[PDB]
Amino acid sequence: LEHFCECYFNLSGLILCPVLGSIILLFIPNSRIRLIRLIGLCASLITFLYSLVLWIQFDSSTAKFQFVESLRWLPYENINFYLGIDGISLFFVILTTFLIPICILVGWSGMRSYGKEYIIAFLICEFLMIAVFCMLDLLLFYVFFESVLIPMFIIIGVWGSRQRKIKAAYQFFLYTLLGSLFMLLAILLILFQTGTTDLQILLTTEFSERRQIFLWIAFFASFAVKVPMVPVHIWLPEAHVEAPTAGSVILAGILLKFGTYGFLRFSIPMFPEATLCFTPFIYTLSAIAIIYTSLTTLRQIDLKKIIAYSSVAHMNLVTIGMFSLNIQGIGGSILLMLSHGLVSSALFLCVGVLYDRHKTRLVRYYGGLVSTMPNFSTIFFFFTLANMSLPGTSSFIGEFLILVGAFQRNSLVATLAALGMILGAAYSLWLYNRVVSGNLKPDFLHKFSDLNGREVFIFIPFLVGLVWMGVYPKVFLDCMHTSVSNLVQHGKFH
Amino acid sequence: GITYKGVTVHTPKTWHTVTGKGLCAVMWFWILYRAKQDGPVVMGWRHPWDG
């Protein structure tokens, strides 16, 4: 059944753009560095504009999948795959298309040593990440998710700063592969029952409570590694710290979102009965991760480790929201996911600004920076506040909505989750003050440069996006509520 | 000002001394004024409606 779309801008062209960029960049000699830079940046920017147009034609009254286009695999047509988005995946496509040009711009100065391999790796990552978010099939979702492991492994290992990147890349690859292997088993068990992997059909098929429980456990084994939930989160600090800056931006801003996206797209709607049974279990794991990892963050001494550990606590608050199973909880969970991809990405950009100049991540060396880099200090303070979920910032909207949705279900989990307001404030301000405030230490650092024109421009869309969501989240919530409402109602008829 | 053995004290500005004395004098008068208008009331001697 050729369910092709009538719109002019569709998902296939968006998936094809960065692929064309990579193919063209395959054949350009490494002496034409200017041309390589320009072509990569332009391909990413056109992809961003294309995704913005997809936003423009979005229809916010339907709970159906929009811009659905079919892609055929066999002329037998037994196995035929569909692409489409709804209010739950649209903004994540947008976020991917926006973060990739940032990743290219961050490594602009070193592009004479990075080479076309760096741009091609990021453009290939873009294609797979956009595709993952646009899949209406369990099997294609699985296959595209693992494809990102190859370029992410390459990015971490080749362009990481020090040789701990070896261990980091190994751990990342092995943990993620294990998780994806448990998902494969569940996909093949689903396919044994239903004879299909088409998501829309699965949303209309009934599962037994026993097999719902079991298949939910099989999905959890992958998603909890992706989120990450305790105690399988220890790969994250190594991988996100040893990666290059743009690698950290992609890892924390997009790849982390895949486990929570998988909870919203597959487990929660497809197995409603099992989801209710495991709700105290998810509540306990998330609450422990929020309290415990926030306290570990307090005692970290590496700049990138503090930011990496903060990401774990923010993502477990997201899981409390999505498993609250109401408009505020799921609505807040998606907004926090988007906000985190901007705030943590900006924070990894601040640390990279410091590291590119002085080549150290230890907090003890820094301090006093407000007297030499006031521009960086002001930008760093703003994203420090956004990381504390200050009202008026994008992160406060998602945070409070999740707490609202949790309070209406279980007042205890909402209380433990609200403890991150105290803990998250403690490590964010302690980090900012030890780096920016105080006096300089000329025996460690004596030569300083504030942000240049490229770094300031890089920070601009992050400030605008954070403010825009923090003061007027209605432009996002309006386009989501119809898909959110039907996700909550899935499996009940009263 | 006046010097007494090393340590010198400068005289205050004239309007500073005038305002200080004047504001407290305004305060002392307002206190005596009020105490005679509603002093028996707070002592409990009479009541406001007495008359």
Partner: protein, 76 residues
């Protein structure tokens, strides 16, 4: 001090004494007053006073929303 003279900042750093600070201060005055004009117009458009004041008040000169929410069983 010595190195802070080579450091750019939005607030001007230490002991900022711009030579033309008076014309810049007066230009800054005008910008705020020009910014205030749309704000005041929008404020006057948005205010809601369900109660007539006991005496005439300065906001009856520009605001036309006095005694309007009497029909409350119609508000949506």
């Amino acid at each position: 001090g010595d190195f802070r003279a080579k450091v750019w900042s939005m607030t001007g750093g230490p002991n900022c004494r711009p030579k033309h600070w008076r014309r810049n201060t007066a230009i800054a005055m005008f910008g705020v007053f020009l910014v205030c004009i749309p704000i005041a117009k929008l404020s006057a458009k948005l205010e809601q006073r369900p109660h007539m004041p006991v005496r005439p008040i300065p906001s009856q000169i520009w605001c036309k929303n006095f005694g309007t929410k009497d029909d409350y069983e119609k508000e949506h």
